């Protein structure tokens, strides 16, 4: 090594020329995926091309906790309260995720509105030709059915930037927000030291 330069981190001491992966087939995968999507669309005509319905859920992880995304499936609670049986939901284009847990009414009603919307704008062909059973749909509106393409129920990733204009009140000015914000940090630090003295306060007195 020589004149002032970063300390190298070349991870090329193995036989990397046996494992170079080149991307010359990138246009090829694009075109093959496109072909596969056409031939799935024609087969699942007239089902929606995005597939079954997906829930609005929150991400994990402090960095993205506020940013909603499509999940994997509706929970059993949600299907039950929207009035759609467990074994029937995957049939009619509704995913089911028996592993999720509903921890909030805010989440449950948010997805219940999606179940109701999907059932509102859902059409179901009869299993046979003339026999129209319960849960079916009438021929007169069956006859205009199309294959919706793309995302038919979009999810907003963050709540919209809205900044209204309001009064600045006197008791709002008096609020020492930093002092507030240090007090609970102090309490979190002292949480053990407080409860210990409480424990022996009970144990002795």
């Amino acid at each position: 090594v020589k004149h002032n330069n970063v300390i190298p981190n070349g991870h090329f001491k193995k036989h990397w020329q046996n494992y170079v992966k080149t991307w010359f087939n990138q246009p090829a995968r694009k075109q093959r995926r496109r072909i596969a999507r056409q031939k799935k669309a024609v087969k699942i005509f007239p089902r929606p091309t995005s597939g079954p319905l997906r829930p609005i859920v929150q991400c994990q992880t402090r960095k993205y906790n506020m940013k909603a995304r499509a999940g994997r499936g509706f929970t059993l609670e949600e299907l039950k309260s929207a009035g759609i049986p467990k074994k029937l939901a995957p049939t009619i284009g509704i995913s089911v995720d028996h592993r999720r847990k509903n921890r909030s009414l805010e989440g449950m009603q948010s997805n219940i509105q999606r179940l109701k919307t999907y059932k509102a704008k859902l059409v179901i062909f009869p299993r046979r030709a003339r026999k129209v059973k319960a849960g079916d749909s009438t021929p007169e509106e069956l006859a205009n059915a199309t294959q919706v393409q793309g995302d038919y129920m979009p999810i907003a990733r963050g709540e919209k930037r809205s900044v209204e204009v309001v009064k600045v009140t006197e008791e709002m000015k008096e609020f020492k927000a930093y002092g507030k914000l240090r007090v609970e940090r102090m309490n979190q630090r002292q949480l053990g030291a407080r409860q210990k003295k409480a424990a022996e306060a009970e144990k002795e007195e």
Partner: protein, 51 residues
């Protein structure tokens, strides 16, 4: 025997230009289509085109 430093498939074949720089270049090319002296310099026989 070999060639020196044999040619390898993982050269940089495709180079990248900024999307906005492509757009700027297409703007300059469209502008240059409009100037009769530029077309005639560039090698097109235009002595009878109307406008």
């Amino acid at each position: 025997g070999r060639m020196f430093a044999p040619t390898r498939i993982w050269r940089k074949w495709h180079r990248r230009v900024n999307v906005r720089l492509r757009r700027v270049a297409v703007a300059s090319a469209l502008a240059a289509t409009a100037v009769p002296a530029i077309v005639t310099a560039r090698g097109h026989r235009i002595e009878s085109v109307p406008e």
